[PDB]
Design a protein around this ligand. Structure first.
Ligand SMILES: Cc1ncc(COP(=O)(O)O)c(C=O)c1O
Ligand SMILES: *Cc1c(COP(=O)(O)O)cnc(C)c1O
Lengths: 468, 464
């Protein structure tokens, strides 16, 4: 009778298994004293080596899971996880995943989702209301930021080809003769998905012209102007600009308004990469810091970085829904997607808004913005810490200065902090120099928590200088 | 900040988890048919009564009853017999509950730790089942579509690196001769192939459809003749996509003989096994996938034939160095995604908890049940059947304009909600479709769905 299948017969076996994991996760989460254990990949691989997947009930697998996974997990909920763009998650997100695991709707078509199809559209339309895109706009949920950025360069590429080579559609015929000339402009601090996407699209990293940044690490529009004009004097064709409203390392917001004027003047597609920055769409006071986003031709948004939603939760938005035609009364969302089978990720944003306010999200995001201002204060205050910027969002790039030696010393500080497990820090190269990075996404993290991690950073730094 | 999942909110997590278990038990118990029949414009009339700017679980879940659960398509229900939406196994739900709490992103060791290694464990195992050689590797993806984009990306980029020494498309974009490159697939191949080639900048034109057999397997003598015709136009054969389980017919292209042709031309062989991967765990049916081991890449969907929740898919290559085009155990060096969830836990827990043998037992039953559904379809004088089931699907139509009658049967059935059936188009004619992914569908269910099909059809002709 195939006892393993979710159905009416198995509802009691489902709820008891769910009861066991709550007991196991409750004990696990209560005994988390620190964000990581320090274990090294080779140390952990030792315990994987004699496991043989061609071979115990839930209780036995979960006992083994305890050791292989939970023991050394990176705990993003812990206040001292201040590394990459991994947010703590909110309860209505887990509420949604639990339901989603039972129904397993596929939201590519109405006939595999029903109300899931309409719910996604609601979340999308609500998002578009916050961005301020005009009437005929639309969007779609994707795997995340990377696939949204692919869809953005795909549409820029294909829409340009349709307006400049009369009914020569890339979809059918591939790339026209003059594609090798097309150029996309992005900040040197843009996410690498842009370049990866142009590889995939058959134009290569060479189609991307990196544009210098400001002294506040924002893309310099004077330098963009210069790049577009140098490009026009080589016979090359400017096609698009990627503006990043929250760079991954600096949290810096490119000047949206200025970029959008340059774009229109040269007929270019404006894509706003908001994967991190989209958190400001829910801030009572900070929302104005994204002004100029309403002008974009497309927008990428990650709810799984800045809206405390589990992975995957992210979406891609267009100003004009007709451009989505390059990717394709029954509502079938597959017509706007580059995936086929797709999970009901929108339930997460749907149940979050329904249960928790939208203002509950903004309150959190605001608290993390104010906390980062405090960390910038504490970092700058320190004579041994060199800070590069005042936080435009939730991230702070800094280093310990007691060149190729200062690089060694900071890369060893991060490795030590990691091995100690007592906090998780991230790293970045800025102009070929190793910096350390703090990204703040937990609004329960306090002043005292940041103080602790700073002391750890300077302990291990002084340890590199002084040796113990 | 009360709503953040952490140590202080664990009791609230547990209380809400119990709420959903109560709500879902009630709901699934009262599911008496696979769908309600509601139209989109109908359910929409309720949805606009919701303002997303305007506050607890209990109220949210009460609302969710009418807007989502009420009219959901229930794939567990034995009279769901439409597309490839499998019931789901309990260890898959086990994995999801944990995944939600921990939320690792398995693109990097520093955002998942053991998540990274567990994934590499499930990839190695699937690899052993496929039988690719030593330096093979793979990666979880969002699904078959992305997996097939990966296939065609690698066939494209590897071809160029090998023929245009030190011209990597990664950097320079498409080389001079690329508008000549051609990929060959069956006419019953999945549309993700053409879509990938559009993305890749080569276009639907770069795909050459190949005629199929009397059993809807691609015909290697027609493949030969397409390659040879392509050569004679001076275009460049680069890849073949074999489908070890076509979406519509469940037919398996002849892997053995396609591989011999590819190797003779130095083409890339992709096996799209999104559906036909289920055979990897079957005691006795595995040999029908023989030849897969000769592939340069493979697509597998755990969310189609392994009873895993969406998303659960993977991409496999014979030679790992080809994953260099897409570029501490960091799995992102082999992906075209960045942030990516721990879908591999579903497969890990399923294998740990249930037998790999308990997956094959279920798939074997569904394959048996499809042979009976074909007998019952063939027996009916009003039903025309096209094929003996190579897998789990059966394409057929009601033959008492005939295209119009069958298209209206599928719709009438969906509107009754007593069953859910699919449909498809072969040689410009409209056919209906059964696909059987539920071990608990009985003969009597299949007999019930045919009578519904015949009743609505007779209503088209007669009018009553
Ligand atoms: C600005 C920006 N864009 C794009 C991405 C890629 O996002 P994802 O990991 O969700 O695919 C990231 C990370 C990011 O910080
Ligand atoms: C469904 C399917 C695909 C696409 O996979 P998704 O998981 O839906 O993206 C590819 N190939 C075949 C044979 C399929 O049946």
């Amino acid at each position: 009778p195939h006892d393993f299948i979710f159905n009416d017969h198995q509802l009691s076996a489902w709820a008891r298994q769910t009861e066991q994991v709550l007991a196991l996760m409750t004990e696990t989460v209560k005994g988390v004293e620190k964000p990581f254990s320090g274990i090294l990949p080779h140390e952990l691989a030792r315990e994987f080596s004699g496991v043989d997947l061609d071979q115990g009930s839930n209780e036995a697998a979960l006992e083994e899971l305890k050791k292989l996974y939970l023991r050394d997990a990176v705990w993003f909920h812990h206040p001292k996880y201040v590394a990459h763009l991994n947010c703590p998650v909110v309860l209505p997100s887990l509420l949604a995943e639990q339901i989603m695991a039972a129904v397993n709707s596929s939201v590519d078509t109405w006939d595999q989702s029903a109300g899931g199809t309409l719910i996604e559209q609601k979340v999308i339309d609500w998002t578009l209301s916050r961005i301020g895109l005009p009437a005929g706009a639309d969007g779609i949920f994707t795997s995340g930021g990377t696939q949204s950025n692919l869809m953005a360069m795909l549409l820029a590429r294909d829409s340009w080809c349709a307006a400049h080579h009369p009914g020569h559609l890339i979809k059918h015929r591939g790339l026209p003769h003059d594609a090798a000339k097309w150029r996309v402009f992005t900040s040197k601090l843009s996410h690498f998905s842009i370049q990866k996407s142009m590889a995939i699209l058959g134009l290569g990293y060479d189609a991307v012209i990196p544009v210098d940044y400001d002294e506040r690490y924002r893309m310099d529009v004077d330098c963009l102007k210069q790049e577009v004009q140098r490009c026009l004097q080589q016979g090359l064709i400017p096609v698009a600009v990627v503006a990043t409203s929250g760079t991954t390392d600096f949290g810096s917001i490119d000047p949206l308004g200025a970029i959008s004027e340059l774009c229109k003047h040269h007929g270019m597609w404006m894509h706003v990469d908001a994967a991190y920055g989209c958190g400001l769409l829910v801030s009572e006071s900070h929302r104005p810091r994204l002004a100029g986003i309403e002008k974009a031709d497309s927008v990428t948004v990650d709810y799984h970085k800045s809206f405390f939603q589990t992975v995957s939760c992210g979406a891609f938005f267009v100003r004009d829904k007709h451009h989505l035609s390059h990717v394709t009364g029954t509502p079938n969302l597959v017509n706007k997607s580059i995936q086929t089978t797709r999970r009901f990720d929108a339930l997460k944003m749907w149940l979050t808004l329904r249960v928790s306010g939208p203002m509950a999200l903004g309150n959190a995001f605001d608290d993390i913005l104010a906390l980062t201002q405090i960390a910038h204060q504490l970092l700058n205050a320190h004579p041994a810490i060199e800070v590069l910027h005042v936080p435009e969002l939730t991230t702070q790039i800094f280093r310990y200065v007691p060149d190729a030696l200062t690089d060694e010393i900071n890369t060893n500080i991060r490795k030590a902090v990691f091995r100690s497990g007592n906090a998780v820090i991230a790293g970045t190269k800025v102009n070929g120099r190793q910096y350390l990075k703090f990204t703040l996404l937990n609004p329960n993290t306090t002043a005292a928590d940041i103080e602790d991690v700073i002391a750890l950073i300077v302990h291990y730094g002084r340890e590199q200088v002084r040796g113990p």
